[PDB]
Amino acid sequence: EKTYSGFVAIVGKPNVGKSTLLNNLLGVKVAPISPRPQTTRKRLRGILTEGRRQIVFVDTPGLHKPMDALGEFMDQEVYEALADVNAVVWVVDLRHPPTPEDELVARALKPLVGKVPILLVGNKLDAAKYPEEAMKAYHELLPEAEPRMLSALDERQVAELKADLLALMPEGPFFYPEDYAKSDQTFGEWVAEILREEAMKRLWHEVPYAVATKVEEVAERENGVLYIKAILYVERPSQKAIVIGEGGRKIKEIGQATRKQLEALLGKKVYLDLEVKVYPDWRKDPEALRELGYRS
Numbered sequence: 001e002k003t004y005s006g007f008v009a010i011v012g013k014p015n016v017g018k019s020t021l022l023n024n025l026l027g028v029k030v031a032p033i034s035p036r037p038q039t040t041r042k043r044l045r046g047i048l049t050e051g052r053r054q055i056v057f058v059d060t061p062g063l064h065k066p067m068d069a070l071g072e073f074m075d076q077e078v079y080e081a082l083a084d085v086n087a088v089v090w091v092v093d094l095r096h097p098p099t100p101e102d103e104l105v106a107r108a109l110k111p112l113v114g115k116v117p118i119l120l121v122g123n124k125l126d127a128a129k130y131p132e133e134a135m136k137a138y139h140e141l142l143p144e145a146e147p148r149m150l151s152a153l154d155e156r157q158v159a160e161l162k163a164d165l166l167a168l169m170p171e172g173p174f175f176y177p178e179d180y181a182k183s184d185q186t187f188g189e190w191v192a193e194i195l196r197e198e199a200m201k202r203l204w205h206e207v208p209y210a211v212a213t214k215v216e217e218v219a220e221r222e223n224g225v226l227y228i229k230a231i232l233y234v235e236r237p238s239q240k241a242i243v244i245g246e247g248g249r250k251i252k253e254i255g256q257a258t259r260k261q262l263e264a265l266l267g268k269k270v271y272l273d274l275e276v277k278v279y280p281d282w283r284k285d286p287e288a289l290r291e292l293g294y295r296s
């Protein structure tokens with residue numbers, strides 16, 4: 001009879017496991033993940049429907065001090081993610097004590113204390129040496145939050161968190177139909193993000209942060225083969241050379257890894273063509289940002 005529905009923002013500094021947590025809460029990979037401290041750049045909605053209850057999760061960019069136009073967009077994305085939700089999941093890395101970036105998040109959540117439930121989720125319990133001490137320090141930054149320690153990779157602990165969040169949703173009609181996709185994004189966007197993820201993990205120094213991607217063509221082909229053409233943009237000529245690599249070895253590595261992940265997630269054959277292009281300092285180009293989808 002009755003139905004419950006709400007939004008849950010997932011926030012925290014970069015690299016704590018926010019996107020990993022979302023994918024595991026949903027049971028399907030919808031968000032890019034990488035070991036680099038600036039992977040997510042735009043809010044991403046993950047739709048969880050369980051029985052008569054629905055949660056629209058909002059993954060967000062890691063909170064940080066903006067350095068350029070892209071950073072400003074990202075900062076605005078976090079701010080807007082926190083404007084109207086029914087609960088907030090603040091993810092922290094239990095492997096170390098709070099950093100100034102974590103304190104930045106605690107500060108951003110103060111106005112929500114007492115207004116919306118805040119769950120302080122300590123992540124990476126599996127790799128933390130001093131989980132308890134770390135968790136205690138994080139909690140002192142926002143005493144009002146409900147603390148818990150887990151690994152976003154642990155099925156049982158994540159399922160427990162999911163149950164606790166569903167019980168917090170207010171009565172109301174579902175925001176999305178119960179048969180809606182697991183995330184609110186186009187197939188093209190999802191593919192471009194998978195490619196960016198594989199690129200970021202295989203590039204170093206400043207290059208990962210200069211990478212943007214876009215799918216320009218998707219089409220049925222060959223013998224049940226899905227054809228995909230995508231562009232990997234960089235900000236400068238020296239980066240293009242490095243992404244391509246000696247004899248095109250680097251871009252081939254990236255392309256192969258992306259094709260294989262795509263085939264494993266889609267369960268079908270994929271033929272992927274990649275082209276590397278320079279989009280002149282696009283992170284500072286308002287027009288470029290709009291073309292690339294970082295619009296607002």
Ligand SMILES: Nc1nc2c(ncn2[C@@H]2O[C@H](COP(=O)(O)OP(=O)(O)NP(=O)(O)O)[C@@H](O)[C@H]2O)c(=O)[nH]1
Pocket residue numbers: 012013014015016017018019020021032033034035036037038039040041060061062063123124125126127150151152153154
């Ligand atoms: N050992 C361990 N690693 C984890 C866990 N959860 C996430 N990670 C790792 O932490 C890194 C960052 O995870 P990710 O989900 O991209 O973090 P994020 O908070 O979304 N980063 P950003 O804000 O930049 O988008 C990845 O290498 C990921 O595999 C966990 O429970 N245990």
Ligand SMILES: [Mg+2]
Pocket residue numbers: 018019020032033039040059060061062
């Ligand atoms: Mg992320």
